[PDB]
């Protein structure tokens, strides 16, 4: 998965 | 409200112990309870708002992968029938997930949002709105899913516009709000040029602001300006 | 139940699909559900059972934890009081896990335990009963904390004597019967050198007799046998 | 801890 914060 | 009774204060005290316990159901429904009692939040009671729906839905969006997951392979040329079970089962999951990110627009909604005056807490509270819109996307396939799509992108482009003006580009809430938003394009939009350009401008204008920190800030900007690095690498 | 109208065969279904999706609530209360239709557990699924209440009660022993080590600090000589929250908090949890232990227990005396002829299912269930009953005592402080330890002694103790009679010495339900009853000793019934003897005397037979397992028999066995060895280090 | 299966 991409990166979320 | 079963949280009506407990005091407001008390309520903040049991969200940081079950954070500190990893009981994030019990965390959201404290801070749910807390949001209820009226008052606006302060910006350690914003981040255990947070934190608590980001590790629940967190679950639910990961289980709602491996099921949809296997739902896809028993539905591939050659599978072995396996009965309504794992549609049904995903389909719980699935709704479970809508019921929490309803919940937390519904937070945002009455009345989170409205009494937002400072960028900081608006910009947090419309980032969130944009991110559960988000993830009630990530599961959306009717008449309405375009529409889901838009209301994130509405309330992340208000966030933006309102970072723009209001906070220095190495604000870790810009930051934040700038890396999920380049996500939600990649991701969600089919529009990975906009999420790349996004990221790379973000991370340059950034850089560029870090002369002006001190340490601490320094390390909060270089996090998650990292983490904008490692998207960009995934995708370029 | 409101399992009641979903069909045996589902609910073991979708039991395995929770343990994939790690969603362990759901896991046990779809075996839950399974036991309530009334027919005995075959292997597969009596650890199903198992792993899904070890795993939910397991969370909950590790909030337990966490809470009562922080109400502890928050009553030694020089704390700031902190009000009621930590104790009610802990409180809360200590109920939860009370509630999962008894329902466990109440699954196994309706009636799966009256049922279990075989050597294989009635230790693995008097282990259970040993085990949730150690659990209960993990938090036990009042007139009935002795009537506990003693409820899963005697549950331990006919295990321990079915499973001498009934099954070799590598046998992996005998071995972590040990391992568990060892445990109780140690930590529940303040009989460390109980609980060395047995982790060793089991250790040893069990040494004896790998000669007679074909290797996937033998990998089995000495998984636990390590478990037992890992104990003695720690306690000698 | 120690070990429990
Ligand atoms: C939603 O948008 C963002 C979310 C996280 C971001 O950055 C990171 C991940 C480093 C972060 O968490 N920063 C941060 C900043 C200020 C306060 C707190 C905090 C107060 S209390 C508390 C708790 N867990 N108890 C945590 C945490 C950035 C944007
Ligand atoms: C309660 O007493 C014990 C519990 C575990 C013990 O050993 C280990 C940990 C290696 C183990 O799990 N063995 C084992 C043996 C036979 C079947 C299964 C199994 C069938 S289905 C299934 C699932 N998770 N879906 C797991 C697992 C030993 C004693």
């Known amino acids: 998965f991409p990166a979320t914060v | ?236």
């Open chain 2, 1 to 236: 409200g079963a949280m009506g009774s407990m005091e407001r204060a008390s309520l903040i005290q049991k969200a940081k112990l079950a954070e500190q316990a990893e009981r994030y159901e019990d965390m959201a429904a404290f801070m749910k309870g807390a949001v209820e009692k009226g008052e606006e939040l302060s910006c350690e009671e914003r981040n255990l708002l947070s934190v608590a729906y980001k590790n629940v839905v967190g679950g639910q969006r990961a289980a709602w992968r491996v099921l949809s997951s296997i739902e896809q392979k028993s539905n591939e040329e050659g599978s072995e029938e396996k009965g309504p079970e794992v549609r049904e089962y995903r389909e719980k999951v699935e709704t479970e997930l809508q019921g929490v990110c309803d919940t937390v627009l519904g937070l945002l909604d009455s009345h989170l949002i409205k009494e937002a005056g400072d960028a900081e807490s608006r910009v947090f509270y419309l980032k969130m709105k944009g991110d559960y819109y988000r993830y009630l996307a990530e599961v959306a396939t009717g008449d309405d899913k375009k529409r889901i799509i838009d209301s994130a992108r509405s309330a992340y482009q208000e966030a933006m516009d309102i970072s723009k003006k209001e906070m220095p580009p190495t604000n870790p809430i810009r930051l934040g709000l700038a890396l999920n938003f380049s996500v939600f394009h990649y991701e969600i939009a089919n529009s990975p040029e906009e999420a790349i350009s996004l990221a790379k401008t973000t991370f340059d204008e950034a850089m560029a602001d870090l002369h002006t920190l001190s340490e601490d800030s320094y390390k909060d900007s270089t996090l998650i300006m990292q983490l904008l690095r490692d998207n960009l690498t995934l995708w370029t």
